[PDB]
Amino acid sequence: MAVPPTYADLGESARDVFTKGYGFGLIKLDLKTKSENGLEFTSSGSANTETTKVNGSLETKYRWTEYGLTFTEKWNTDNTLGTEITVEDQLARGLKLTFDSSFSPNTGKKNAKIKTGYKREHINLGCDVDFDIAGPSIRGALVLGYEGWLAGYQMNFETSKSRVTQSNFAVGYKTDEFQLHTNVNDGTEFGGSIYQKVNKKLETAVNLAWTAGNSNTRFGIAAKYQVDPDACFSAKVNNSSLIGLGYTQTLKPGIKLTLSALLDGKNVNAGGHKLGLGLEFQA
Amino acid sequence: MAVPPTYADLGESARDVFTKGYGFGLIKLDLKTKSENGLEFTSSGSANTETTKVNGSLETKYRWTEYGLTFTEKWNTDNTLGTEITVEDQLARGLKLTFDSSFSPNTGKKNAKIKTGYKREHINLGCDVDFDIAGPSIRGALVLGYEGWLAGYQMNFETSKSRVTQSNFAVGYKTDEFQLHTNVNDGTEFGGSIYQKVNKKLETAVNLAWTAGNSNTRFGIAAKYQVDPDACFSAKVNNSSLIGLGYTQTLKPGIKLTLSALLDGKNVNAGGHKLGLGLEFQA
Questions:
Q1: I want to staple A44 with a disulfide (CB 3.0 to 4.6 A). Which of A57, A75, B173, B273 is the partner?
Q2: b/e per residue, B163-172, with b = 16+ CB within 10 A?
Q3: B80 has a chain A CB within 8 A of its CB
Q4: Looking at beta carbons, which residues of chain A come within 8 Å of B256?
């Protein structure tokens, strides 16, 4: 409806067409459960094919939807630990508060974060305070919506240098079938994307990017074809001659396999082409 | 050395040749981590190919080896929850105490268990008290060792019927290369097995079983060939004409795939042959 996305979510759909259905040079094992009320868990195994380094993630999550509450514990294989409490729609509809705690016993270094979001018709506001060692930093964002139009600002203030270190503007238009998104970062990096839901089975995206000091231009084109409900193909090219190819199949209910190939241009089937395999398991 | 196994462990090796390297009619996803001191986790996803029912297990484990302590939390997709505290070698070398707690919110039904084991040269004693609803039951076991010989007794007393409900004897001989194991259950079921470590690459087993009231006989033969350190083949037959075939490959370090086939005899490649796929991920 008329409640705009967060700054970060501006351009998500186009990004989603380019990123999801590919995991080049990785073998991924995902185990998730679904409990809309109560206890949930996500375990993830990742193996880099070029390095053979193997990562492991567990996330434990209690949703208490009566109280708009979510508690999340996370663990990785570097022994880094994470707590996240989230209150949503409690003191007021569209308000969201998150207290987030981090601790790597590997380094002894902590990290706490308080994130606030307020959201209503035409406006999406955020303020994120990172209480870092060499912090805090505060990241604030405002998105305003006008009849499918979206204008955004995002800034980051590092108290150590007592200065703004990031200043991003975004402008866009957004129906369900079509999204224009444009952004400039630090008055220097230019981005734009078009996402089109061409029909129920085909998503396409175009991506543009360039720098204020530099006459060259980066672009990609991307497509996602949902052949049937249990299979989909994804392909992308960029003007650096890279080709991405992606196939996701549901083998059995709750079991999805993804095969990925990233090919280099001209030297196609003549050298260093990354492959990927993802297996997702839903219970 | 001269410290014998537990009653349950009598015949493990032979059982291991018959069971490991096969998972017929199942798709399994295992994610484990290794931390000999501290935090460990095992997540398991199982899909029955014939039913398409999908099971999910998480196990969380802190080992505190300074104190011989292990805490384990477990969860399954039926919402059943489990705690296990374990003290080993603390008040005395070879003593092991376990307090184990269960609770299915699905049924509201609890289950607590206290298990004690004492172990030393020539003897392996256990007493397990299941504090069940329609319990308790106490299961006690004694294994005695004499120069490779092993004699065992195992009983179960249900306090509700105030009677012994199980009474098992086992006799065996056991070097590292070779195990004879024989057992009679409730004076009626007869079991025996031979395990031979024929060399560093080949394990074989033979299995026999029959009933005091019944002139028929069940047997299986089983082999496990370790071709190289990253591949192994397993095959078994039984006198009911079933054939098991198993291949386990290490694809990348920490990633192991198992393909299983269970074939019916005479009707081989002419009907209902179960297949299996296991993927194990170590991080």
A1: A57
A2: eeeeebebeb
A3: no
A4: none
Q: Number of helices and strands (H, E) in chain A?
A: 1, 19
The two tokens of residue B217 are: 């006989």
What is each CA distance from A108 to A71, A80, A133, B127, in whole angstroms?
23, 10, 11, 43
Between chain A and chain B, the number of residue pairs with CB atoms below 8 A apart is 91
Across the interface, whether the CB atoms of A58 and B41 are under 8 A apart is answered yes
Cα A138 from chain centroid (whole Å): 20
Q: Which position has the token pair 């501006």?
A: A10
Alpha-carbon distance A13 to A206, whole Å?
A: 11
Kind of pairing, strands B255-263 and B243-252?
A: antiparallel
To test the contact with chain A by mutation, choose from B30, B32, B41 the residue with the greatest count of A C-beta atoms within 10 A, namely: B41
Residues 6+ apart with CB under 8 A from B230: B249, B250
Question: What was the elucidation method?
Answer: X-ray
Query: Rounded CA gap, A231 and A262, in Å?
Result: 20
- Rounded CA-CA distance B11/B150 in Å is 11
Residue appearing with tokens 């079933």:
B242
What resolution in angstrom units was achieved for this structure? 2.6
Distance from CA of B277 to the nearest CA of A (A): 12
Copy the structure tokens of residue A116: 């606030």
- CA–CA min distance A55, chain B (Å): 6
Residue of chain A whose alpha carbon sits nearest to that of B282 = A54
Give B118's strand partners. B95, B125
Q: Nearest-CA residue of chain A relative to B50? A: A252
How far apart CA B190 and CA B279 sit, in angstroms, is 36
Closest approach of chain B CAs to the CA of A245, in angstroms? 22
Q: Is residue A168 within 8 Å of residue A139, measured between CB atoms?
A: no
CA distance B82 to B71: 10
Rg (CA), chain A: 21
Lookup result for tokens 């795939």? B257
By the 10 Å C-beta count (0-12 exposed, 13-18 middle, 19+ buried), B67 is classed as exposed
d(CA A23, CA A16): 13
Contact B43 A55 (CB under 8 A): no
CA distance B23 to B276: 5
User: Considering Cα of A59, then A280, then A237, then A169, what sign does the dihedral take?
Assistant: negative
Tell me the domain boundaries of chain A. Answer: 1-283
CA angle at B207 for the pair B203 and B213, rounded to the nearest 5°: 175
Q: How far apart are CA B143 and CA B124, in angstroms?
A: 5
Classified as helix, coil or strand, A160 is coil
CB contact under 8 A, B253 and A38: no
> What's the half-sphere exposure (Cβ side, CA atoms, 13 Å) at B124?
18
SS3 state at B272:
coil
Q: If we measure between CA atoms, which residue out of A119, A129, A168, A116 comes closest to residue A8?
A: A168
What are A174's two structure tokens?
């957004």
CA distance A278 to chain B (A): 12
Query: Would you call A43 an interface residue with chain B, using a CB distance cutoff of 8 Å?
Result: yes
